[PDB]
C-alpha cells in the first residue's frame, strides 16, 4: 500500500499540545446575541455559506457576518477552534462573536470587516513589486497557521482579502482547515479544482501543510503569467493532465514510485508522455516585467509533485525573490 508521509517542519506541535487545543468535537462554545448585528447586504452565497456585511449594535462597528448552511453545519466547532487558537496571529481574520441565526438555527460567524476587495480582482493587475509584497504577507499567515498545527487547505486567491489602499491582507474561509497530525490520513476533496495539490488528485491521504505551499504556487503562477487560472483543468483527472503538460510526466512518475501511490488506470490513456517545461516558456511581452530569475526559481521550488520537497513557508519566506521587499 502507499508509504506513509510526515511533514519535514511543525510535525509534533499537536502531541505537546493539551488535549482542548486539538480535540475541538470535546469544545464548548459560549454562543452569543444575535440580536447585536443588523444585516446590511449579502455578499455573496457559495455552495456551503453565506455571507453579509453587517453591523454590531452594541459598538457601532461594521462586521461580517458567515453564516452556515445546514450542510457545512458539521464541523462548526473545528473552524471555530481553529480561528480562536490562530486569533490575533499575522494576517488572519480576527473571529469576533459565534451567535446562533434566528430563522434557521444554523450557526453564524462574527469577523472584523476588511474595508478593500477579494484578492482575485486585483491579483491580475499588480507591478512586480506589489506581487512580491503580497506574497510575503501571505507567507506570514502561512508560516504561522502552519506554526500553529493547522493546515489551511483552501489556499485560493477568493480566500485572500486585500484592502490595496493600506496595504493589508487578510487570509479568510477557515471553513476546511484541519489539525496536522502526524501519520493521519486526511479528506482528499478539498481546495478548489485549480488549486488541488497532486497529492489530492492521486488520492494520496497523508499529506500535510506543504498542500497550502503548491496552493500558493498556482497562485504565483497565475499573478507572474497572467494567466488565470495557471492550471485549467476540465475536471479533477484533466486537472493532473494540465499540471503534467507543465511538469512533465517523468517526475510525476517518481513522485508515484517515492510513495507507492496506485495511480487510477483511467490515468494510463490521458496522461500521456510529457517533458519538463522551462518557466520562461510562459513569458511574454505582457508579463516579462513580472519575471525575473528569483521569481522562476522561487516559483520551480513551490510546484513540485513530491509534497516533501516543496518549500516550506519559512524557507519561502528566505528566497531571494522578496530581498527587494521592505521589512
Ligand atoms: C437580529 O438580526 C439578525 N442578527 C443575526 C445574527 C446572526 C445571523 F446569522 C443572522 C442575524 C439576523 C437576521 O436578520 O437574520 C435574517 C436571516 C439571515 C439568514 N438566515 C439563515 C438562512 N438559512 S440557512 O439554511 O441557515 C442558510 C441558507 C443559505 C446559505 C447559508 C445558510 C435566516 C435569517
Not at 149 to 169: C, S, T, W
Amino acid at each position: 500500500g502507499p508509504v506513509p508521509s510526515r511533514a519535514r517542519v511543525y510535525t509534533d506541535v499537536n502531541t505537546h499540545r493539551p488535549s482542548e487545543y486539538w480535540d475541538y468535537e470535546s469544545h464548548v462554545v459560549e454562543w452569543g446575541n444575535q440580536d447585536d448585528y443588523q444585516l446590511v447586504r449579502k455578499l455573496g452565497r457559495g455552495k456551503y455559506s453565506e455571507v453579509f456585511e453587517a453591523i454590531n449594535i452594541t459598538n457601532n462597528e461594521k462586521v461580517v457576518v458567515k453564516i452556515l448552511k445546514p450542510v457545512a453545519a458539521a464541523k462548526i466547532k473545528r473552524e471555530i477552534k481553529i480561528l480562536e487558537n490562530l486569533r490575533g496571529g499575522p494576517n488572519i481574520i480576527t473571529l469576533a462573536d459565534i451567535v446562533k441565526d434566528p430563522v434557521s438555527r444554523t450557526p453564524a460567524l462574527v469577523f472584523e470587516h476588511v474595508n478593500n476587495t477579494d484578492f482575485k480582482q486585483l491579483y491580475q493587475t499588480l507591478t512586480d513589486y506589489d506581487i512580491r509584497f503580497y506574497m510575503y504577507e501571505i507567507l506570514k499567515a502561512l508560516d504561522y497557521c502552519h506554526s500553529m498545527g493547522i493546515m489551511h487547505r483552501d489556499v485560493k486567491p477568493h480566500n485572500v482579502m486585500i484592502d490595496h489602499e493600506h496595504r493589508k491582507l487578510r487570509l479568510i474561509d477557515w471553513g476546511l482547515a484541519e489539525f496536522y497530525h502526524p501519520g493521519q490520513e486526511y479528506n482528499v476533496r478539498v481546495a478548489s479544482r485549480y488549486f488541488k495539490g497532486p497529492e489530492l488528485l492521486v488520492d494520496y491521504q497523508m499529506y500535510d501543510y506543504s498542500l497550502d505551499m503548491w496552493s500558493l504556487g498556482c497562485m504565483l503562477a497565475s499573478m507572474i503569467f497572467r494567466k488565470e487560472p495557471f492550471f485549467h483543468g476540465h475536471d479533477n483527472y484533466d486537472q493532473l493532465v494540465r499540471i503534467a503538460k507543465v511538469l512533465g510526466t517523468e517526475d510525476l512518475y517518481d513522485y508515484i514510485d517515492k510513495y507507492n501511490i496506485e495511480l487510477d488506470p483511467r490515468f494510463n490513456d490521458i496522461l500521456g508522455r510529457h517533458s519538463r517545461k522551462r518557466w520562461e516558456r510562459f513569458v511574454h511581452s505582457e508579463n516579462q516585467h513580472l519575471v525575473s530569475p528569483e521569481a522562476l526559481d522561487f516559483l520551480d521550488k513551490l510546484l513540485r509533485y513530491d509534497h516533501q520537497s516543496r518549500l516550506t513557508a519559512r524557507e519561502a519566506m528566505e528566497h531571494p525573490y522578496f530581498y527587494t521587499v521592505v521589512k
